[PDB]
Amino acid sequence: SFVEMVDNLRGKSGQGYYVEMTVGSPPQTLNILVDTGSSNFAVGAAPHPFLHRYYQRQLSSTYRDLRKGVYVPYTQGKWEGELGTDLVSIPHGPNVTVRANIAAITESDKFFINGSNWEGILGLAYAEIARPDDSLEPFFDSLVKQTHVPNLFSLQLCGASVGGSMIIGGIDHSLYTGSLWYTPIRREWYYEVIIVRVEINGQDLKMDCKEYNYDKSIVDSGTTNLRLPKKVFEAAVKSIKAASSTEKFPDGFWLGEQLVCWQAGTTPWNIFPVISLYLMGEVTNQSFRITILPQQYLRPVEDVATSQDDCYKFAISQSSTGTVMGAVIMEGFYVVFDRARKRIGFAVSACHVHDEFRTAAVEGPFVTLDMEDCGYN
Numbered sequence: 262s263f264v265e266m267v268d269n270l271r272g273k274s275g276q277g278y279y280v281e282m283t284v285g286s287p288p289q290t291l292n293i294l295v296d297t298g299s300s301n302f303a304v305g306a307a308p309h310p311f312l313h314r315y316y317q318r319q320l321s322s323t324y325r326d327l328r329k330g331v332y333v334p335y336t337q338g339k340w341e342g343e344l345g346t347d348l349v350s351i352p353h354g355p356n357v358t359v360r361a362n363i364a365a366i367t368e369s370d371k372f373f374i375n376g377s378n379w380e381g382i383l384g385l386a387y388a389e390i391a392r393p394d395d396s397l398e399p400f401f402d403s404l405v406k407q408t409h410v411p412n413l414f415s416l417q418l419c420g421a422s423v424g425g426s427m428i429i430g431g432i433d434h435s436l437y438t439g440s441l442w443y444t445p446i447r448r449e450w451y452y453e454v455i456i457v458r459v460e461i462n463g464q465d466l467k468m469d470c471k472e473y474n475y476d477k478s479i480v481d482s483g484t485t486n487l488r489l490p491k492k493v494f495e496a497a498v499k500s501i502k503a504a505s506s507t508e509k510f511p512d513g514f515w516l517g518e519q520l521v522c523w524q525a526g527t528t529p530w531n532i533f534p535v536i537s538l539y540l541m542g543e544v545t546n547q548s549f550r551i552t553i554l555p556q557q558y559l560r561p562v563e564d565v566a567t568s569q570d571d572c573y574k575f576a577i578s579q580s581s582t583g584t585v586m587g588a589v590i591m592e593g594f595y596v597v598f599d600r601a602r603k604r605i606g607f608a609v610s611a612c613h614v615h616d617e618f619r620t621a622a623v624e625g626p627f628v629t630l631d632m633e634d635c636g637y638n
């Protein structure tokens with residue numbers, strides 16, 4: 262019965278993917294961003310210039326105040342609000358209703374996006390990173406405890422404005438090709454994984470693999486970019502610059518700030534390399550790789566001029582808090598968050614990015630010795 266959930270995600274490019282939800286009795290409809298990089302369910306609950314509607318606790322007979330404040334600071338953006346519970350449903354999801362924690366957002370800074378069409382965020386990660394503390398049950402834990410929905414979900418994020426699917430409770434085999442390859446969830450807080458090897462155009466970066474995971478590596482649908490630790494970011498940008506030295510880009514383009522444009526349909530895709538991330542496998546000394554095309558880490562944007570030039574932002578940025586496999590990385594792939602078996606699955610998506618001579622891939626098995634040493638302690 263997963264077909265009812267296919268194509269239940271929408272979004273604008275760089276602005277996240279949302280699913281339609283209802284809160285309260287009678288049901289109030291809100292668009293909620295799906296974020297595997299946090300664990301708080303939160304909705305606008307007060308007027309905001311960029312909100313087109315919001316949760317009105319005053320109108321829900323099933324609302325219950327928790328008499329406790331809450332605030333969440335992200336890498337970029339933050340909000341504060343009042344905690345409570347209410348009944349929640351997913352119209353294009355399973356046919357159930359859960360009593361869930363809801364943070365009613367009353368103040369926010371650089372969080373809501375101008376003309377974005379979503380009004381809240383659904384944090385799909387584990388209680389350990391919930392605010393104010395791990396005793397606030399995240400939505401998906403409530404869904405699993407209160408219903409018969411199996412303890413996993415999968416995300417198929419499709420590129421450019423954007424759409425996709427969130428399959429709640431299972432795997433839809435018509436959304437991917439090939440085999441699913443699984444990597445262990447190292448720890449149930451973020452969706453933390455271990456990267457064991459990195460290659461650019463087939464060339465190993467040849468760094469101590471601990472650097473790739475310093476201080477952690479996570480899968481985060483709520484972060485747009487691929488974010489790399491400083492040492493890894495410098496090696497990759499050095500390598501991507503060299504592969505595309507045919508052409509010249511402002512140094513502010515490599516910092517994510519400036520666009521680059523080309524006369525429409527002449528984007529020189531061939532001079533940007535592919536990036537291969539190797540992930541810890543399920544059996545001893547075994548890994549698999551995902552290959553990222555340049556169509557994934559060059560994000561399309563709007564021409565500042567009156568031209569029809571294709572314009573792009575560099576969507577690899579530097580991090581001081583570990584590797585983040587963001588939406589840019591997930592777009593090629595069908596991604597299974599198998600919480601019940603503590604693993605994450607990757608396969609080539611049915612809506613996969615298309616190059617003329619290259620293709621995004623999920624390939625295994627690979628042999629990788631000493632994968633355990635790649636985890637950071």
Ligand SMILES: C[C@@H]1CCCCCCOCC(=O)N(C)[C@@H](C)C(=O)N[C@H]([C@H](O)CNC2(c3cccc(C(C)(C)C)c3)CC2)C1
Nearest residue numbers: 275276277296298299334335336337338390483484485486
């Ligand atoms: C704020 C956003 C939700 C709204 C914006 C969605 C699309 C906009 O896209 C721009 C973009 O890429 N943004 C805004 C990144 C830079 C970011 O900050 N994204 C967030 C993620 O939750 C961040 N997740 C991490 C994180 C960082 C810091 C704290 C925490 C808590 C405390 C919640 C555990 C979690 C794990 C990386 C969601």
